[PDB]
DNA sequence: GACCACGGCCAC
DNA sequence: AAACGTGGCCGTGGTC
């Protein structure tokens, strides 16, 4: 089809490339090609050939930009059909699916990938004609954001390896104590990591009551929520829960992360996936640095391992009560607007009530648990579940849900308005017009339809918060480059920056103002900021 | 070795 | 587990 032409391609050509593995910071570049003008250009040696491109345009452009940055090359990502497709329909998450849907096949050959990129861009650009709000999201948020994310991925974050190595040995001994006690109490050994074997021990051998079932297979559940209901029914349960806490943290964070330090940077590199969620959030993988522990004492020790370069400090910025502020703007509830114009904190107020203590007496943990309650109730938690979570009667949980919504009466009205337009249109949208298609709003099975409803009216709130965070990153990044600071991590409504010590205070003030003023709403956005040598100390 | 489904659980 | 939502990683179990 396309005519074979010699490398290098003309400027503006679409790129195709093949990696030895999905992670750009770790991949060998196996092949590189470009397409334009009815021609395909295949690079004889892909690494040297990278130097000839001025921009990465095509499928997965950010990934190639990250690998280019790793090699010390300034190759910014530009147009990417994945971003066009993701804005049309966020279920467009993979190149295999986007190709099949919009006019090609995702193969394992760079030249074909280049040609595909060119063809898909033409077609998806056609599909977005007249979709001015989606085009605004593309031009003003997603396309420039991909350059920011590429820099973040290639920079990475420093980890106190030696500290985590020592911690692993300590936690191993504590796990053995717990495992040995569980085996003694069971009367025999078994694989405590096997929920099938544990199910048999707890409910058949020890005759404990089984209060819940698993979704797909209908086994008697051994989840923490079920075990919590049995803490006093048998001493083994407590040991199991402690075993699970420690093995989760050791197997997921303590042991794996030190092995992922990159040999050239000496740092840890995540991937920020831009077309991965139904709501417009980013995701993080390989490793996921958006679920680093924070709750328990051991979790906090793990978070302390994330440190600044010597002579630098971390700056952590996190939006206050962000989805409740977004809800206030979307719904227009005067009571909820007044809450934020008055400086009130709904998480602290729920915590004080939950634990029966003055606001002053609430600590960050109790507040973070009240946060779960406030959003749980908002997005549809049942009184049955709430009464279990809070250890109160069904009747008192029922009453809490009623007063919650009676306090902000326009919220329920906004919920039902959102679902009505989602039924008529087939999608719901954020403040900026990002869409999520929810066909099951018309489902004839109530449980399916009602699950769809909770997904559907969550998306405008969570997605607007994501749009705002993304726009803030796009605005903030060039200001940080000017000041010699780095953007390292995003955790949905939070940024972790790295700044020279002498500039950390100025960077913190600037980043806070950029984030708070990203897009004025009917309520102020407030950002909490901290500075410290480690991630835990920077969020205090 | 790989793949996947599942339960389970960490964070936002 | 349960009528909160959004993700990704773990080990197990089954399979190729
Ligand atoms: N549905 C749901 N959404 C959640 C949950 N946890 C977080 N989110 C969503 C809604 C949250 O607004 C958003 C960011 O989460 P945080 O920064 O941890 N909490 P926030 O910003 O509310 O309070 P502050 O920062 O003052 O402590 O993620 C949850 O349990 N459920
Ligand atoms: Mg210890
Ligand atoms: Mg799953
Ligand atoms: Mn927040
Ligand atoms: Mn946060």
Q: What angle do CA A289, A295, A300 make, to 5 degrees?
A: 70
Residue with tokens 């640095």: A289
Q: How far is CA A539 from CA A294, A442, A490, A533, in A?
A: 10, 43, 14, 11
Measuring from the CA of residue A199 to each C1' atom, give the nucleotide at the shortest distance. Answer: B7
Residues A315 and A333 in one domain: no
Residues A265 and A404 in one domain: no
Beta strands A283-285; A158-159: pairing state: unpaired
Could you give the 3-state DSSP secondary structure of residue A451? Answer: helix
Instruction: Sort A103 into a burial class: Cβ within 10 Å, 0-12 / 13-18 / 19+.
Output: middle
Give the span between the Cα atoms of A500 and A482, in whole angstroms.
Answer: 13
Cβ atoms of A83 and A93 within 8 Å: the answer is no
Give the span between the Cα atoms of A391 and A397, in whole angstroms.
Answer: 9
Give the span between the Cα atoms of A110 and A34, in whole angstroms.
Answer: 8
Residues A49 and A76 in one domain: yes
Residues A242 and A388 in one domain: no
Cβ–Cβ contacts within 10 Å for residue A221, how many?
18
Cβ atoms of A464 and A431 within 8 Å: the answer is yes
Q: What is the extent of the structural domain holding A290?
A: 272-321+466-538
Distance, Å, A254 CA → C13 C1': 25
Cβ atoms of A167 and A301 within 8 Å: the answer is yes
Please check whether strand C approaches the CB of A398 to within 7 Å: no
Provide the terminal-to-terminal Cα distance of chain A, rounded to the nearest Å: 60
Distance, Å, A21 CA → B2 C1': 14
Give the span between the Cα atoms of A470 and A2, in whole angstroms.
Answer: 38
Cβ atoms of A57 and A117 within 8 Å: the answer is yes
| Nearest of A486, A487, A490 to residue A469 by alpha carbon | A490
Beta bridge partners of A490: A495
**A159 φ, ψ to 5°?**
-130, 140
Residues A19 and A150 in one domain: yes
Residues A50 and A17 in one domain: yes
Give the span between the Cα atoms of A150 and A65, in whole angstroms.
Answer: 6
What atom in ligand 1 is closest to the CA of residue A371?
22
Residues A346 and A366 in one domain: yes
Beta strands A435-437; A427-429: pairing state: antiparallel
Using N-to-C axis directions, what is the helix angle for A364-378 and A346-355, rounded to 10°?
100
Give the span between the Cα atoms of A479 and A305, in whole angstroms.
Answer: 28
Residues A236 and A179 in one domain: yes
Long-range contacts of range A40-45, CB-CB < 8 Å, 24 or more positions apart? A40/A2, A40/A3, A40/A4, A40/A5, A40/A111, A40/A114, A40/A115, A41/A5, A41/A6, A41/A7, A41/A8, A41/A9, A41/A13, A41/A114, A42/A4, A42/A7, A42/A110, A42/A111, A43/A7, A43/A110, A44/A7
What atom in ligand 1 is closest to the CA of residue A320?
26
Residues A57 and A204 in one domain: no
Cβ atoms of A273 and A82 within 8 Å: the answer is no
Per-residue buried b or exposed e for A156-187, using 16+ beta carbons within 10 Å of the residue's own CB = bbbbeeebbeebeeebeeebeebbebbbeebe
What the block records as the tokens of A173 is 């001994």
Q: Where are the beta strands (DSSP E) in A261-390?
A: 271-273, 283-285, 306-307, 312-319
Residues A444 and A525 in one domain: no
Could you give the 3-state DSSP secondary structure of residue A149? Answer: helix
What the block records as the tokens of A415 is 């919920």
Give the span between the Cα atoms of A242 and A308, in whole angstroms.
Answer: 31
Residues A123 and A171 in one domain: no
Residues A257 and A137 in one domain: no
Chain C: positions less than 7 Å from a protein CB are: 1-13
The residue whose CA is least distant from atom 28 of ligand 1 is: A323
Give the span between the Cα atoms of A225 and A203, in whole angstroms.
Answer: 15
Within A 414-453, residues with CB less than 7 Å from strand C: 447, 450-451
CATH number at residue A109: 3.30.420.10
What the block records as the tokens of A207 is 């005759």
CATH number at residue A477: 3.30.70.370
Give the span between the Cα atoms of A133 and A435, in whole angstroms.
Answer: 10
Give the span between the Cα atoms of A235 and A230, in whole angstroms.
Answer: 9
Experimental method for this entry? X-ray
Residue with tokens 């290639």: A154
Spacing, Cα A50 to ligand 5 middle (Å): 37
CB of A195 shorter than 6 A to ligand 1: no
Give the span between the Cα atoms of A355 and A362, in whole angstroms.
Answer: 8
CB of A239 shorter than 6 A to ligand 1: no
What atom in ligand 1 is closest to the CA of residue A367?
27
Give the span between the Cα atoms of A63 and A60, in whole angstroms.
Answer: 6
Distance, Å, A195 CA → C14 C1': 15
Beta bridge partners of A319: A527
CB of A350 shorter than 6 A to ligand 1: no
Give the span between the Cα atoms of A275 and A82, in whole angstroms.
Answer: 7
Resolution of this PDB entry, in A?
1.5
Chain B: positions less than 7 Å from a protein CB are: 5-12
Give the span between the Cα atoms of A466 and A154, in whole angstroms.
Answer: 22
From A322, A364, A454, A494, give the residue whose CB has the most ligand 1 atoms within 8 Å, as the site to mutate: A322
Q: What angle do CA A208, A212, A216 make, to 5 degrees?
A: 130
The residue whose CA is least distant from atom 29 of ligand 1 is: A372
What the block records as the tokens of A240 is 């199991």
Please check whether strand B approaches the CB of A216 to within 7 Å: yes
Residue with tokens 């919009």: A102
Could you give the 3-state DSSP secondary structure of residue A296? Answer: coil
Report H helices in A191-321. Answer: 195-199, 224-228, 235-249, 297-303
DSSP state of A250: I
CATH number at residue A206: 1.20.1060.10
Count of domains forming chain A: 4
Give the span between the Cα atoms of A177 and A171, in whole angstroms.
Answer: 10
Beta strands A39-42; A3-5: pairing state: parallel
| Nearest of A254, A229, A255 to residue A241 by alpha carbon | A229
């Amino acid at each position: 089809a396309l005519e074979e032409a010699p490398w290098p391609p003309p400027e503006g050509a679409f790129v195709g490339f093949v990696l030895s593995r999905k992670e750009p910071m770790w991949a060998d570049l196996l092949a590189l090609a470009a397409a334009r003008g009815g021609r395909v250009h295949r690079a004889p040696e892909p690494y040297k050939a990278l130097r000839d491109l001025k921009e990465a345009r095509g499928l997965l452009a950010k990934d190639l930009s990250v690998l280019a940055l790793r090699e010390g090359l300034g190759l910014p990502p530009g147009d990417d059909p994945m971003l066009l497709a993701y804005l049309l329909d966020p279920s467009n998450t993979t190149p295999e699916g986007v190709a099949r849907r919009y006019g090609g096949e995702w193969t394992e050959e760079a030249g074909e990938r280049a040609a595909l990129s060119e063809r898909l861009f033409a077609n998806l650009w056609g599909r977005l004609e007249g979709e001015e709000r989606l085009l605004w999201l593309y031009r003003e948020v997603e396309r420039p954001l991909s350059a920011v994310l590429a820099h973040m991925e290639a920079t990475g974050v420093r980890l106190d390896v030696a500290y985590l190595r020592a911690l692993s040995l300590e936690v191993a001994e504590e796990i053995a104590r717990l495992e040995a006690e569980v085996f003694r109490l069971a009367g025999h050994p078994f694989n405590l990591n096997s929920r099938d074997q544990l199910e048999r021990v707890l409910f058949d051998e020890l005759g404990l009551p089984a209060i819940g079932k698993t979704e797909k297979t209908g086994k008697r559940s051994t989840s923490a929520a079920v075990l919590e209901a049995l803490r006093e029914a048998h001493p083994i349960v407590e040991k199991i829960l402690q075993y699970r806490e420690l093995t989760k943290l050791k197997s997921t964070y303590i042991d794996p992360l030190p092995d992922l330090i990159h040999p050239r940077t000496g740092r840890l590199h995540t991937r920020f996936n831009q077309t991965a969620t139904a709501t417009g959030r980013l995701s993080s993988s390989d490793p996921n640095l958006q679920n680093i522990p924070v709750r328990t004492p051991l979790g906090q020790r793990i978070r302390r391992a994330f440190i600044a370069e010597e002579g630098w400090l971390l700056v952590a910025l996190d939006y206050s009560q962000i989805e409740l502020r977004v809800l206030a703007h979307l719904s227009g509830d005067e009571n909820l607007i007044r809450v934020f114009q008055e400086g009130r904190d709904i998480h602290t107020e729920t915590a004080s009530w939950m634990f029966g203590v003055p606001r002053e007496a609430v600590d960050p943990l109790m507040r973070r648990a009240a946060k779960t309650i406030n959003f749980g109730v908002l997005y549809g938690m049942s009184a049955h579940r709430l009464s279990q979570e809070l250890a109160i009667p069904y009747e008192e949980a029922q009453a809490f849900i009623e007063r919650y919504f009676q306090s902000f009466p326009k919220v329920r009205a906004w919920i039902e308005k959102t679902l009505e337009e989602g039924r008529r249109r087939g999608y719901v949208e954020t403040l900026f017009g990002r869409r999520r298609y929810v066909p099951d709003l018309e489902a004839r099975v109530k449980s399916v339809r009602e699950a769809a409803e909770r997904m559907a009216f969550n998306m405008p709130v969570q997605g607007t918060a994501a749009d705002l965070m993304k726009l803030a990153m796009v605005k903030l990044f060039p200001r940080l480059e000017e000041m010699g600071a780095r953007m390292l991590l995003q955790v949905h409504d939070e940024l972790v920056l790295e700044a020279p010590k002498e500039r950390a205070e100025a960077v913190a003030r600037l980043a806070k103002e950029v984030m708070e003023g990203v897009y004025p709403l009917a309520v102020p956005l407030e950002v909490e900021v901290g500075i410290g040598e480690d991630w835990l100390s920077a969020k205090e």
